Each structure stands twice: as C-alpha cells, then as structure tokens.
Amino acid sequence: KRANYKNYRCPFLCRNIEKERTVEQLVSRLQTKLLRSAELVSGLQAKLCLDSFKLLYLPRTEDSYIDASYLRLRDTDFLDCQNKRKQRWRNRWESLLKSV
C-alpha cells in the first residue's frame, strides 16, 4: 500500500469475517468462495458526476451474488437453535436486568 484523502472508518465489522491465519490464505478462501458460488451476476454499472464525485447508478441494472450454502439451509434446526436459544437467554437477561 501507501500511507500518503483518508477519513476511512470501515465498511464492515471485522469480527464477522473471522476465519483465516495468513492473508494469502484469506485471498485463496475468497477465490474458492467465488468459484463454487451458487449464483453470481454483475449487471450493475454507474457513472461519475463531473466535479461532484458521486456515483450515478444507471437504472435497470442490478448485481446479485448468492453463496452455495444459502440454498442448503434447512428450517428445522434453524429456528430451533436460533430462536430458542435467543428467547430463553433474553427472558433470563430481562428478568435479571429488571431488578434494579
């Protein structure tokens, strides 16, 4: 890179993408996540506004990615695990939090 413009904060939350050890292994994981994709479309285009450097997305154009596991999700332990764990822990923390 360089370090010479930048009021960057971040797009995303670095906790969310936690897998890997090196950084070239991170890049390899992205590549094999794109090659084995279940859908990948990149119609979306845009254009730059002169002397007002904003993007102008030309209409009717869209982009769409879908990963392979998305179509492999079962809705039996989906709500079972997520919703049951969540609601029980939430009732517990609500009963405890409402004693002050």
């Binding site: 971040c10 939350l13 969310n16 904003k54 998305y70 969540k86 923390w93 609500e94 409402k98």
Partner: protein
C-alpha cells in the same frame, strides 16, 4: 474531498461481501425511495423455485411530483427486482403503509400537505392509465394546521388511523364512521400533550389499551384512549432522552418491551411495568440515528439505521457477556452486524416477514438492496 473516500469504502465493502452475506441483491432504481413494506404472504412456484414476493414503495420522481409503485422480487424457495404498475400519487408521500386486515387499503401523508389521504381498491381500479390530473383519493381527512409526520393502522379492531402533525398534537380518526355529509365526525379523538414537533407515533400489537408517541420536546408519551381526559395530559410522559427523538418500535412477541431513539446516538430500550429508568442504553452509532425496527421473527433482534450510513443489527440477549479483549474494539457485545454497502443514507429499511434474516434497505442515490447476513454470524 469526502466522496472519493466513500467510493473507496464502497469498493472495499463490495470486495469483502462474499464473507458477510449469503445473498445480496442491489437493483438500481429510477427515483429516490421514501417508504417500504412487504406484502404479507407469498405466491410460490415450487418446481420453478423462484418464489414471488411483493412490496409497495413510494418515490419522489421530481420536485413536487411524487408517485407510488409496487415491486416484485424473485427469491429462491429453499433474481431480479421487477417494477410493477405505477400510480402517480397526487401529493407527497412519506407514510405509505398498508393495513394488515386486508392488503389493499392505503393511507399516505405528505411532508408539505396538511391533510391525510386514504385510498382504497376503488381508487386503484378507477385509476385510468391516462390521468392527466393525478389519482383520485378515496377520501382526504383535514383537521391539522401544518404538515403531518407519521401514520399507523390498528391491529385488533379494523378502522382507525392515528397521526401526529406539526402542531405537536395527535389525532386519531375512525374510518368506519366516515360520512362526507359530516366530515367532522371522523375524529375519534385528538390529543394535546406535546409542545413542539411531534415526530413519531405508533400503535400496539396486543393493543392492550395502548398507544405511543414522541416529539422534539424530549418526551415519550404513552396514552390510553379509553380514559375520559386522555386528550390534555397523557398517562405516561417519561423524559427519557437528550436530543430530538426520531422513532419508536414496539415488540411483536412480548408486549412489554419498547425502544426509543434520538440524536443521542443511543437507542434506549424501555420496559412498561416500571417506566422510569432505561433498562440498557445502546451505543455503537457515530451520528444521528433515525430508523429503529424490531424483528417480526425474534424477540430481541433489533435493527437501527443512522446518518453514519450504516445499518446496525443487534442481539439484545448478549447484554453483558464474556467476550475476549481482542474483539472488544469493534464495539459492545450487543452489536451483531453492520451493513455499509450504501454510498448514500438509507431512507427506509424493512424486514421481510416470510424469510428469516432478510432485509430490504432503500438508499438515497436510487438504490434498493435485499440482503441476508451469513449463517456464520447468526448461527452457533
């Protein structure tokens, strides 16, 4: 000086997405969007897979020239977003929201016009596709003095409409008693409690003799319409905020939890059994927070949106967990997901009521995204 920075952030976000989302669709639109709501149930195509969803949005095609539109989404039955018929609304629209009892009734209010416009299926069928003059409202209701802010329908007894105008006073109409010979009998009641701009008002799902509203006078007022003197001083008037409040969101499952939100960058979650001190002030936003919506699939999963151009999905269950010091830099343990694929500020977001963990966020630069966080984030 700041726009190319935002473009770099968008490029980084777009290159990183195959990590955060298991589905994300960005269909560039034709006009800015200012409202959103999904149609309740869905027509499915089993052998075809691409089940069809619909949602009714508004637009601001040009200055003063608004519109209304319906869109159709192509989600797979475990994919473009096609615009359907337009409607060319006569005035502004910032509260176009269909009622649950039937998926055809409409109520809209503009940011500049001082009266609510209620529409019905007859107004839709009567709409000829020439309309040199705009659509014909099923009827208008005019009692306020200055423009109104937000609307919401009943959820237990069909026919009434609560609204907060610029005169700092609420007014609830009843539509089943509407008669054009006497348009002054549509006022079920009107409440005079707040002093400055009332910016939001909502109803209750168990309705448990309830209603709620906020304002810019730093107050949260919950009323009870069954009371005789409920028009001058409400039932509860808690002064629980620092800046102008922006929204309110009841909870679908548990009828006690509430949550408010102001420019304090801190949505404050509330309990109605003892409404004197906030249960746990949330933080994580770095500018004015406008939208706060709960999940109609889980109890604590809240979502908020702000002027920092990010959508924060929370998990209220984790208030006070044992997390490692490596990850405690990103923010509290409540913060569960952040969406920042918007080069503009999202104007309205909404959860889809049929698919789990799906949301639709309408940007301001003519964008509308449908996204689902990864399983590795809400799973275990």
């Amino acid at each position: 000086n700041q726009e190319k920075c935002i473009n770099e952030e968008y490029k980084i976000w777009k290159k990183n997405s195959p990590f955060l989302y298991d589905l994300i669709i960005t269909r560039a639109l034709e006009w800015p969007c200012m409202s959103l709501q999904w149609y309740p149930e869905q027509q499915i195509f089993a052998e075809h897979g691409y089940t069809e969803q619909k949602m009714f949005l508004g637009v601001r095609a040009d200055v003063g020239k608004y519109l209304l539109a319906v869109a159709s989404i192509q989600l797979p039955y475990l994919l473009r977003v096609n615009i359907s018929n337009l409607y060319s609304h006569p005035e502004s629209v910032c509260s176009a929201k269909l009622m649950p009892q039937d998926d055809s009734c409409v109520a809209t209010v503009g940011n500049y016009h001082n009266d609510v416009l209620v529409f019905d299926k007859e107004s839709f069928e009567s709409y000829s596709s020439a309309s040199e003059s705009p659509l014909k409202p099923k009827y208008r209701l005019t009692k306020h003095t200055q423009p109104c802010t937000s609307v919401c329908w009943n959820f237990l007894s069909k026919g009434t409409l609560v609204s907060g105008s610029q005169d700092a006073t609420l007014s609830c109409w009843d539509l089943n008693a509407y008669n054009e010979s006497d348009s002054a009998s549509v006022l079920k009641v009107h409440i005079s409690s707040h002093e400055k701009q009332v910016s939001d008002v909502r109803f209750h799902y168990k309705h448990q003799d309830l209603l709620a509203s906020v304002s810019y006078d730093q107050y949260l007022h919950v009323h009870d319409i069954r009371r005789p003197d409920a028009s001058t001083k409400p039932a509860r008037s808690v002064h629980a905020h620092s800046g102008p409040i922006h929204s309110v969101a009841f909870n679908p499952h548990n009828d006690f939890i509430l949550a408010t939100c102001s420019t304090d960058k801190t949505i404050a979650l509330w309990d109605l059994r003892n409404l004197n001190q906030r249960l746990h002030t949330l933080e994580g936003h770095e500018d004015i927070v406008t939208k706060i919506s709960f999940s109609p699939h889980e109890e604590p999963i809240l979502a908020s949106t702000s002027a920092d151009r990010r959508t924060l999905v929370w998990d209220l269950s984790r208030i006070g967990e044992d997390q490692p010091a490596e990850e405690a830099q990103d923010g509290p343990p409540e913060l569960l997901f952040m969406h920042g694929g918007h080069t503009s500020c999202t104007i309205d977001m909404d959860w889809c009521p049929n698919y789990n963990w799906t949301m639709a966020t309408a940007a301001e630069d003519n964008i509308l995204q449908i996204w689902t966080p990864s399983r590795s984030i809400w799973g275990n």
